[PDB]
Design a protein around this ligand. Structure first.
Ligand SMILES: Nc1nc2c(ncn2[C@@H]2O[C@H](COP(=O)(O)OP(=O)(O)OP(=O)(O)O)[C@@H](O)[C@H]2O)c(=O)[nH]1
Ligand SMILES: [Mg+2]
Lengths: 195, 178
């Protein structure tokens, strides 16, 4: 019953997130003035926080969501569907207690006519998670939905193998993400579009 | 050696307002000190990497608010924490008597965590009111180590962070065996 895993390959996924969190933290500088921090966190005032999130964090996070992601899933209601990180987002942002905001964010990025692509929707979603201090929250919510994970991932995918073979490494990932929730983000969800 | 860290730990700094929590972190992380007092609102943090017995260790260090009205949700401070640095001011008897409530807060929120006790502002012998021998004896009773520090003149700060990093590293190696 053995799943084949290269731990270094899985570490690679987390490493890219680490690098992105570091760059984003470096950008917020060492000022102790909260007003300065809010400016550095505002993508209109500081386009650079938007660039960092877009070019480093979004692809590192997408790569996690892509690892061992099934090409297709067979939906009970819809039939066969192309399966993408955005599909996993839809699955893991359904309305329930304690997830109203998360669902609202899914809905609002879904409705933007400016976005025109599922990868762009995914990116706006990440920008959104940062605004509401919930990037780690969402990841942890995703992990704990074993039904979403069995649906969308192969056993060797990181989000799946996390439960079985390498739970510590996924704990690292969540820990790495934690201080993003402390940063005064104010990101335009349409930042990618406006570039 | 610029390689990927071998270990990642989260450290938490707690203790009374004004005691020098931010100053300890600022000196360890940026090697700076300022006489200025800017009270911490919620949490701030610093991410640094140290070398300890050939191992590369990444430290995500959280610096909490001392004032109760600027304290954010306690659950969030503590989640995922490996080591807690408990700070009092050797110049303030009151900051010392509150150490037990901080220790209790740790117990309220953590199962298995390393701790260390820090007496900061050891800069002014004339105004020192918490004597080493009393603090040491108390530390012993709680099974934790004591460091008296000065963020002001950069004394024992590196040593202190090294200690708690070592403790946390040893707890990790021990849990792996068991
Ligand atoms: N003499 C002396 N003063 C210090 C030392 N460390 C900090 N201070 C001063 O004490 C004041 C408070 O320092 P902080 O580091 O902001 O204390 P804090 O625990 O972070 O305060 P809160 O954020 O409100 O909880 C500042 O004016 C510092 O310059 C020290 O080691 N020696
Ligand atoms: Mg402070």
């Amino acid at each position: 019953e053995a799943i084949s895993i290269d731990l270094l390959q899985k570490k690679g996924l987390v490493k890219a997130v680490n690098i992105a969190v570091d760059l984003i933290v470096a950008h917020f500088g060492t000022s102790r003035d909260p007003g300065v921090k809010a400016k550095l966190g505002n993508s209109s005032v500081s386009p650079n926080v938007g660039h960092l999130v877009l070019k480093y964090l979004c692809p590192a996070v997408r790569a996690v969501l892509e690892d061992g992601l099934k090409a297709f899933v067979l939906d009970v209601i819809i039939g066969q569907r192309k399966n993408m990180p955005w599909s996993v987002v839809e699955a893991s942002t359904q309305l329930g207690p304690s997830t109203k905001v998360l669902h609202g964010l899914y809905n609002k990025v879904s409705q933007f006519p400016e976005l025109t692509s599922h990868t762009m929707r995914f990116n706006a979603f990440i920008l959104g998670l940062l605004n509401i201090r919930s990037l780690e929250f969402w990841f942890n919510h995703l992990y704990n939905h074993e039904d979403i994970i069995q649906t969308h991932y192969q056993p060797w995918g990181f989000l799946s193998a996390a439960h079985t073979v390498c739970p510590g490494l996924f704990e690292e990932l969540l820990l790495l993400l934690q201080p993003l929730a402390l940063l005064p983000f104010s990101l335009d969800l349409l930042f990618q579009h406006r570039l | 050696m610029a390689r990927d860290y071998d270990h990642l730990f989260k450290l938490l700094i707690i203790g009374d307002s004004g005691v020098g929590k931010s100053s300890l972190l600022l000196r360890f992380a940026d090697n700076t000190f300022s006489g200025s007092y800017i009270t911490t609102i919620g949490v701030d943090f610093k991410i640094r990497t140290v070398e300890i017995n050939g191992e590369k260790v990444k430290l995500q260090i959280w610096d909490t608010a001392g004032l109760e009205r600027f304290r954010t949700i306690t659950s969030t401070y503590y989640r995922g924490t490996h080591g807690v640095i408990v700070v009092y001011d050797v110049t303030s008897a009151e900051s010392f008597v509150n150490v037990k409530r901080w220790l209790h807060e740790i117990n309220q929120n953590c199962d298995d965590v390393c701790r260390i006790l820090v007496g900061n502002k050891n800069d002014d012998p004339e105004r020192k009111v918490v004597e080493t021998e009393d603090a040491y004896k108390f530390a012993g009773q709680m099974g934790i180590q004591l460091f008296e520090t000065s963020a002001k003149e950069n004394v024992n700060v590196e040593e202190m962070f090294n200690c708690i990093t070592e403790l946390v590293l040893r707890a990790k190696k021990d849990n792996l065996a068991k």
